[PDB]
């Protein structure tokens, strides 16, 4: 069995390789990369997501979100405050503020030792779930607006045809701004560009162990756990390093920086947090080898969840016993 210590794997595809992105995620499991939730992929040197960033400062962040937490430094819950439009050049500023920048550092070492002492004593302003793209059109490979979307390969694997379209979202992040624990919807695979920036701090937790990460959560939120049989879908709970080493679950770090992929596999729970202002791009993939995730994926029916349009699809059809009470929590 290939990476049996489910190890982080990095990888530097050649421009060759960059070619066919269907095929390089099928090399990359065939060495086992998979079992760590989580692969660098380094692009080679040729390439470019666009020629530049100079003309990004009048997008629009319509709703930006404080993250505000409650609990313990490295036991926490955080709910997202929404703010007043802003445009990506106002938010670079803010960012950049005495407020919000950046703290003076040694290593990307300290910085995550400041960030897990620090974090809830503040909340930071996130730019997150903005649909659109900052692949210029002429980017042939691993252009992330163009990829197989997953209605398609759910027709190609499963011969059923359904409604549904799978785009990208774009996330303008700063110092602190912090993902919590999850796993995508419908446990699909994602992949995330960082076009630009400070980097991103990952931690992931090796799917063949995710039950333990979900055990410990129901100990650690135990009033959310009684609430919801899947309370981590409401992607609100974050756990520190120290209190997952302390509890003995598996996991793994690397930190992205600017110009690299992260694809991250089916059940393969995430979390994580930027280390100053930045902007990353992600959307959700399938293969085949997810069908069978996706037909076992818990599913949050509390009502806290709510996703979009074109997961009732995925529900209706790979778990149609689900689907009644699913789609009573969406409705
Ligand atoms: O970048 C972030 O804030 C969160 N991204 C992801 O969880 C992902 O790409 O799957
Ligand atoms: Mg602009
Ligand atoms: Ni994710
Ligand atoms: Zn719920």
Excluded at 85 to 106: C, D, F, I
Excluded at 272 to 299: L, V
Aim: proline share 5%.
């Amino acid at each position: 069995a290939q990476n049996p210590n489910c190890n982080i794997m990095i990888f530097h595809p050649t421009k060759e390789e960059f070619n066919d992105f269907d095929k390089y995620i099928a090399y990359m499991e065939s060495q086992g990369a998979h079992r760590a939730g989580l692969a660098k992929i380094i692009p080679p040197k040729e390439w470019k997501a666009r020629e530049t960033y100079d003309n990004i400062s009048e997008i629009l962040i319509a709703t930006p979100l404080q993250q505000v937490a409650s609990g313990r430094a490295g036991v926490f819950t955080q709910y997202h405050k929404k703010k007043k439009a802003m445009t990506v050049g106002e938010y670079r500023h803010l960012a950049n503020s005495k407020k919000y920048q950046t703290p003076p550092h040694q290593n990307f070492e300290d910085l995550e030792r400041k960030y897990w002492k620090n974090r809830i004593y503040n909340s930071p302003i996130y730019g997150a779930d903005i649909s659109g793209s900052l692949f210029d059109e002429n980017t042939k490979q691993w252009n992330l607006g163009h990829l197989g979307t997953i209605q398609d390969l759910l027709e190609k694997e499963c011969g059923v045809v359904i409604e549904g379209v799978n785009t990208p979202y774009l996330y303008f992040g700063m110092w602190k701004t912090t993902f919590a624990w999850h796993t995508e919807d419908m446990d699909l695979y994602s992949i995330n560009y960082l076009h630009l920036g400070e980097p991103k701090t990952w931690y992931v937790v090796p799917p063949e162990h995710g039950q333990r990460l979900e055990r410990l959560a129901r100990e650690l939120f135990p009033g959310s756990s009684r609430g919801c049989g899947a309370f981590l879908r409401h992607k609100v709970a974050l756990i520190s390093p120290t209190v997952l080493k302390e509890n003995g679950i598996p996991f793994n770090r690397i930190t992205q920086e600017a110009g690299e992929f992260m694809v991250t596999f089916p059940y393969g729970y995430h979390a994580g947090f930027n280390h100053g202002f930045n902007c990353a791009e992600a959307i959700n993939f399938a293969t085949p080898r997810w069908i069978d995730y996706g037909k076992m994926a818990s599913q949050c029916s509390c009502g806290e969840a709510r996703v979009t349009f074109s997961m009732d699809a995925f529900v209706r059809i790979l778990q149609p016993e689900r689907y009644d009470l699913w789609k009573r929590g969406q409705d």
